[PDB]
Amino acid sequence: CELSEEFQIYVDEVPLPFPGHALIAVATSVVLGVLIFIAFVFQLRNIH
Amino acid sequence: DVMEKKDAWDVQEFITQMYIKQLLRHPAFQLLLAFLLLSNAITIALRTNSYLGQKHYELFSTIDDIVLTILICEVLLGWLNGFWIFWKDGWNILNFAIVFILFMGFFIKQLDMVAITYPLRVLRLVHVCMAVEPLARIIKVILQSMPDLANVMALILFFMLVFSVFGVTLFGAFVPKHFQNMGVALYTLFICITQDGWLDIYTDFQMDEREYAMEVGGAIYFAVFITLGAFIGLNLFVVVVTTNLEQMMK
Amino acid sequence: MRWRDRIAVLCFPPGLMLTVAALILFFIHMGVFASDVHNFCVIHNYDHMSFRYTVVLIFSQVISIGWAAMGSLYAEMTGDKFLRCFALTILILNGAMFFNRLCLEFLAINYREER
Amino acid sequence: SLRILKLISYSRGIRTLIIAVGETVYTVASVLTLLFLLMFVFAILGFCLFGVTDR
Amino acid sequence: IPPEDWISGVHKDSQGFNMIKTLPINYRPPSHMGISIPLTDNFYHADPSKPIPRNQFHKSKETGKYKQCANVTSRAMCNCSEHQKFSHAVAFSDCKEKVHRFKFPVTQYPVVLEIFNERDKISAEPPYLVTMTEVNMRKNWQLKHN
Ligand SMILES: CC(C)CCC[C@@H](C)[C@H]1CC[C@H]2[C@@H]3CC=C4C[C@@H](O)CC[C@]4(C)[C@H]3CC[C@]12C
Ligand SMILES: *[C@@H]1O[C@H](CO)[C@@H](O)[C@H](O)[C@H]1NC(C)=O
Numbered sequence: 001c002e003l004s005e006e007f008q009i010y011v012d013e014v015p016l017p018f019p020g021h022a023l024i025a026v027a028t029s030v031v032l033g034v035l036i037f038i039a040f041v042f043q044l045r046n047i048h
Numbered sequence: 049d050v051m052e053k054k055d056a057w058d059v060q061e062f063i064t065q066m067y068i069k070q071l072l073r074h075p076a077f078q079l080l081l082a083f084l085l086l087s088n089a090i091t092i093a094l095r096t097n098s099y100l101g102q103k104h105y106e107l108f109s110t111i112d113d114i115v116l117t118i119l120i121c122e123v124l125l126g127w128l129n130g131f132w133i134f135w136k137d138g139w140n141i142l143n144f145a146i147v148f149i150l151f152m153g154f155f156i157k158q159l160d161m162v163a164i165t166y167p168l169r170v171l172r173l174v175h176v177c178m179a180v181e182p183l184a185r186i187i188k189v190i191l192q193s194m195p196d197l198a199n200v201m202a203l204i205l206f207f208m209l210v211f212s213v214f215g216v217t218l219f220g221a222f223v224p225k226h227f228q229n230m231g232v233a234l235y236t237l238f239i240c241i242t243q244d245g246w247l248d249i250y251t252d253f254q255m256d257e258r259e260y261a262m263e264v265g266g267a268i269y270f271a272v273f274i275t276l277g278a279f280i281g282l283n284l285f286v287v288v289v290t291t292n293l294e295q296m297m298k
Numbered sequence: 299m300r301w302r303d304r305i306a307v308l309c310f311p312p313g314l315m316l317t318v319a320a321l322i323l324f325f326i327h328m329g330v331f332a333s334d335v336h337n338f339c340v341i342h343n344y345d346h347m348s349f350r351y352t353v354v355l356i357f358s359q360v361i362s363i364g365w366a367a368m369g370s371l372y373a374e375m376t377g378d379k380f381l382r383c384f385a386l387t388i389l390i391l392n393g394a395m396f397f398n399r400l401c402l403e404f405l406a407i408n409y410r411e412e413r
Numbered sequence: 414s415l416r417i418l419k420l421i422s423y424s425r426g427i428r429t430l431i432i433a434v435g436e437t438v439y440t441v442a443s444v445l446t447l448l449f450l451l452m453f454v455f456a457i458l459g460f461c462l463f464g465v466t467d468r
Numbered sequence: 469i470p471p472e473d474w475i476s477g478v479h480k481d482s483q484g485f486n487m488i489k490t491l492p493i494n495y496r497p498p499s500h501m502g503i504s505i506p507l508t509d510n511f512y513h514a515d516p517s518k519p520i521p522r523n524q525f526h527k528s529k530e531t532g533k534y535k536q537c538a539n540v541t542s543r544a545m546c547n548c549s550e551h552q553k554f555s556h557a558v559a560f561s562d563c564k565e566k567v568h569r570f571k572f573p574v575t576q577y578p579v580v581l582e583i584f585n586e587r588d589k590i591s592a593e594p595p596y597l598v599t600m601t602e603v604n605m606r607k608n609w610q611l612k613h614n
């Protein structure tokens with residue numbers, strides 16, 4: 001006779017797939033970039 | 049001189065002057081980078097503990113991405129001034145290698161594990177901290193002293209080989225498992241050169257013929273050799289240190 | 299000079315062209331954003347939505363942002379307000395479109411694949 | 414023992430020796446920081462080499 | 469997990485983690501093309517009286533077969549029993565509500581099998597080779613064995 005069994009497993013709290021990590025990294029990178037560049041433009045324009 | 053109207057290359061040199069004015073002379077940007085690196089160092093010290101990492105693993109991944117992207121942004125900004133000068137530098141090669149290994153292990157699958165991710169981060173911690181002045185002189189003179197350390201190390205190893213021939217004549221298959229295997233024998237001799245706790249070895253070859261045997265001879269030869277070599281090595285170390293440090297004092 | 303000849307050859311005047319490249323990057327990225335929104339809303343054809351090219355067009359996004367910035371900086375010294383307004387408007391629209399696509403991709407996260 | 418340290422706070426000759434050796438505080442602090450960094454490096458290396466495997 | 473907290477469904481493992489979860493109404497397991505689109509045609513907590521969740525897109529709506537909780541009106545109309553409240557098998561899943569829970573990376577989950585032999589209970593033997601299947605067409609699991 002066929003001895004078989006079945007069971008169920010629920011898992012949760014996936015931290016993040018790949019695009020979430022990619023998005024937060026590039027978002028912080030470009031935020032730093034635009035902040036430094038706004039400072040650059042402000043200084044170089046106010047010298048003139 | 050008077051410079052009635054600037055040209056294209058004066059404009060380019062001026063632009064590079066503002067580019068090196070920030071993030072290379074401003075203490076604020078370097079202070080922020082050091083603050084971020086000390087924060088991720090604190091999170092590194094918060095590891096070796098899963099009870100903390102269960103609510104922190106996602107945040108650890110995010111701050112890993114943040115420090116990696118600011119590192120590669122710094123490397124790209126350094127490459128902006130020119131690839132030749134960044135390639136031809138004494139120390140920027142190390143930061144480039146660090147970020148290259150870290151990014152290669154990050155984006156592409158790798159067997160690098162924490163044993164690569166964390167030591168590379170603390171190497172970057174060191175490379176940031178030496179730029180702030182009051183340890184730069186000591187690290188500079190350490191790297192100035194090491195080429196003079198090299199000859200002392202080479203002479204010590206050569207002398208230890210030419211005395212390890214005399215060693216291995218009375219070694220192997222008798223008082224074994226530390227005098228055998230000809231490289232484990234060499235490293236046990238090195239252990240005794242470091243001169244701590246060889247009384248286990250002293251009891252190892254003890255009771256050869258319970259009064260003198262070779263229990264006298266091999267022990268006294270190896271002991272006088274050990275004490276002479278240990279004194280010579282420790283001296284040569286401290287004297288090379290002070291010799292290369294006098295170069296600092298000039 | 300002979301803009302004529304400027305546009306003549308060998309290469310071209312300063313920057314400029316490098317600024318108008320961000321414009322055509324904005325054109326193509328706006329088209330891709332429109333296709334993404336159109337496929338998300340009505341037709342529901344996730345088979346051919348841009349789930350597949352994910353990081354490479356984000357890298358295109360970021361190099362376009364840096365390019366528009368560098369063009370603005372390299373074109374500001376002409377002393378004329380119109381060029382500065384041109385470059386700053388392009389920078390603002392590129393930044394807005396980047397943030398919009400970042401929000402869109404962060405929203406549609408349960409639809410690509412799972413790790 | 415802190416009170417004994419306050420006892421030894423006298424003896425101006427010890428004060429002159431302290432003055433002569435007190436400019437090395439920055440140097441010993443720098444070497445202590447170097448020791449701490451190297452200790453941290455090999456701490457994480459040793460944990461990842463022998464503590465992570467848990468055998 | 470004790471049966472009284474199986475009925476209650478609010479158990480905690482002394483650390484802040486819910487050890488039991490009641491599944492959403494008209495739930496289907498995710499598919500490969502996305503975790504918000506069902507293509508598995510097997511219904512858990514099947515109830516026809518309520519509208520269908522997570523069921524945009526054509527192939528999602530072209531699947532899902534109500535086996536036990538059929539066109540008899542709803543979950544209280546589609547009567548089940550206790551043996552359908554503990555059967556971890558398929559085709560009894562229309563009245564499956566409460567399942568277990570786990571952290572995200574499970575590690576070394578013990579799949580231990582025992583056999584009754586009319587006198588005692590023994591373990592599965594090396595002559596008794598075993599095959600694995602997932603009945604919802606998923607591909608992000610693996611087994612360690614020697
Ligand atoms: C190479 C530089 C200039 C960046 C330009 C990127 C271009 C070449 C990329 C980015 C957006 C891309 C398109 C995005 C969406 C679609 C529809 C999809 O169902 C198949 C791929 C397809 C048809 C892509 C083809 C290539 C494409 C147009
Ligand atoms: C109602 O349920 C019966 C039971 O199987 C089924 O045969 C029949 O087709 C169903 N009718 C409709 C309209 O769904």
Ligand SMILES: *[C@@H]1O[C@H](CO)[C@@H](O)[C@H](O)[C@H]1NC(C)=O
Nearest residue numbers: 536537540544545546547548
């Ligand atoms: C129990 O369910 C069966 C079909 O699932 C149905 O035929 C029967 O009438 C139900 N009994 C009651 C009391 O509802």
Ligand SMILES: *[C@@H]1O[C@H](CO)[C@@H](O)[C@H](O)[C@H]1NC(C)=O
Nearest residue numbers: 576577578579611612613614
């Ligand atoms: C499976 O897990 C058990 C319990 O930890 C362990 O003893 C056994 O070695 C594991 N087997 C394999 C193949 O990993």
